[PDB]
Amino acid sequence: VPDYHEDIHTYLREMEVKCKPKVGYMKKQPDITNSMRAILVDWLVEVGEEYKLQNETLHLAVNYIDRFLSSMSVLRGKLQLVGTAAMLLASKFEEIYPPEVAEFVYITDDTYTKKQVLRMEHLVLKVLTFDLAAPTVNQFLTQYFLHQQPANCKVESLAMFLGELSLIDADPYLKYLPSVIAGAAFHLALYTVTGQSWPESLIRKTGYTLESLKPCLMDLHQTYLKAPQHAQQSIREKYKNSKYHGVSLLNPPETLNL
């Protein structure tokens, strides 16, 4: 229903700037670290597989965790707790059948009580002032997916996997806006699988070119190369399923030709 496509792309681009998190927040986190955030996002992928949640949901959940920690200081035994609450909220916002609070409590191997979950949820709702409709990489990808010639389902799937790896690592991905990670990721997918590049029509819609995307593209490219040694691997595991055409099994390009 490309009736509102330029209208929605245009609004999404304005809200990624307002829904974006502080790039330097981990320097001001007295007790948690990128790696500690890397472990939590991994866990969340896994919870995602476990209840069969949308990938969009894992992506909003992350957006909430980053914006919550952008201004709330958190001890490392509480980081999961922020992570379960953001995850109930994202589920409560996007899923047809949200997992129930029991299930959030159960998958923390009763690290937290139900009452604690439920007070953090509430507390995430006020740090975030109830603004849960953030734009995500996945919202930008799906719009970029409409531009393939013809649709290539390995391409979609590998873009999904890479945009998804961008979630795990706060350094370098918190410097980049969602539209831009999806850019890099859609380019990296098309190139690997088909040899083609960021098409002319997406330049026209997005205003992004290979020159705009390179900074993100170089980074995403080293992430693709090191994927197999990353301490975190649930994204790799997941992308082995049939459902995403086992694209975590494809070989990343040797070079990029930029």
Binding site: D3, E56, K92, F93, K114, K115, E121, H122, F145
Partner: protein, 297 residues
């Protein structure tokens, strides 16, 4: 806390929680209070309240009710809203001796399509237009209300909940189980609502899904592959459907002119890709002379 409001009378129960008319003791504003009973060690803040609150604060428009504030307790959550005089259903039923003049119909249709384009435009689907959710003021304004069933949507959309829209105002894509639905469903409800502002009676008052379908098909014809490519392959499409002929639109809504019939007819296109979008409907020849008369009150 709720210190400054003076509760004045309840208004009713919509999709979730309860609504009261109130007054700001200090400023004098008349607000609509939507009181959501919290309940910890249950599920916590309902998703209906999380979608609405977050989507309504993005939607600020003359024809979308305005959510003025959110008083966030630990037991209760209150949504503070711009208050309105009545709903369309309640007005319609009051104007049923001498109906709604055309100018007021047009203007309301025009004003709803504006609010409805603004929602679609900001990736929001209302999913529950019906006269009870459309509030009117004493100035002629008409506004979309109750965002309890609304939803942020994606481009191309995904499958969303199926249990959606009040039966009578529900679209044929929904009744036959299409895995993907969109914005075309809000327009379909406005189509029914437009027809109702005119005839002063619901267009398709079914009593069940099958009843709904067959009432739609007795009016517009049983859809086929010609009028709607893909219909006969749909999940709840049945080969045995009675094959009904399409009644000529002037008999569907007798009082309407040619522009009005053309416009209602684009709103009710079976095929969701051909249904007119809200934006486009704003430039229909139906509205050349749209004005804003202030209804009787």
């Amino acid at each position: 806390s709720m210190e400054n409001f003076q509760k004045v009378e309840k208004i009713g129960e919509g999709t979730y929680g309860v609504v009261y008319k109130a007054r700001n003791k200090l400023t004098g504003e008349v607000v609509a209070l939507k009181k959501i009973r919290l309940d910890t060690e249950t599920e916590g803040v309902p998703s209906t309240a999380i979608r609405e609150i977050s989507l309504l604060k993005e939607l600020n428009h003359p024809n979308i009710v305005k959510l003025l504030d959110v008083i966030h307790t630990e037991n209760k959550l209150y949504l503070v809203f711009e208050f309105l005089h009545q709903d369309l259903k309640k007005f319609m039923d009051a104007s049923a001796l001498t109906g709604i003049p055309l100018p007021l119909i047009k203007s309301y249709l025009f004003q709803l399509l504006q609010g409805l384009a603004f929602c679609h435009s900001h990736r929001v689907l209302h999913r529950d237009l019906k006269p009870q959710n459309l509030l009117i003021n004493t100035e002629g304004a008409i506004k979309l209300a109750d965002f309890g069933l609304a939803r942020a949507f994606g481009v191309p959309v995904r499958t969303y909940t199926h249990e959606v829209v009040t039966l009578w105002y529900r679209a044929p894509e929904i009744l036959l189980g299409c895995k993907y639905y969109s914005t075309a469903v809000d327009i379909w409800s406005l189509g029914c609502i437009f027809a109702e502002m005119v005839t002063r009676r619901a267009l398709f008052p079914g009593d069940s899904e099958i009843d709904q379908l067959f009432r739609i098909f007795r009016t517009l014809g049983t859809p086929d592959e010609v009028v709607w490519p893909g219909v006969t392959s749909m999940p709840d499409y049945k080969p045995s459907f009675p094959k009904w002929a399409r009644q000529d639109f002037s008999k569907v809504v007798p009082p309407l002119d040619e522009d009005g019939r053309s416009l209602l007819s684009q709103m009710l296109h079976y095929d969701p890709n051909k249904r007119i979008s809200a934006k486009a409907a704003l430039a229909h020849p139906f509205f050349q002379d749209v004005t804003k008369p202030v209804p009787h009150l």
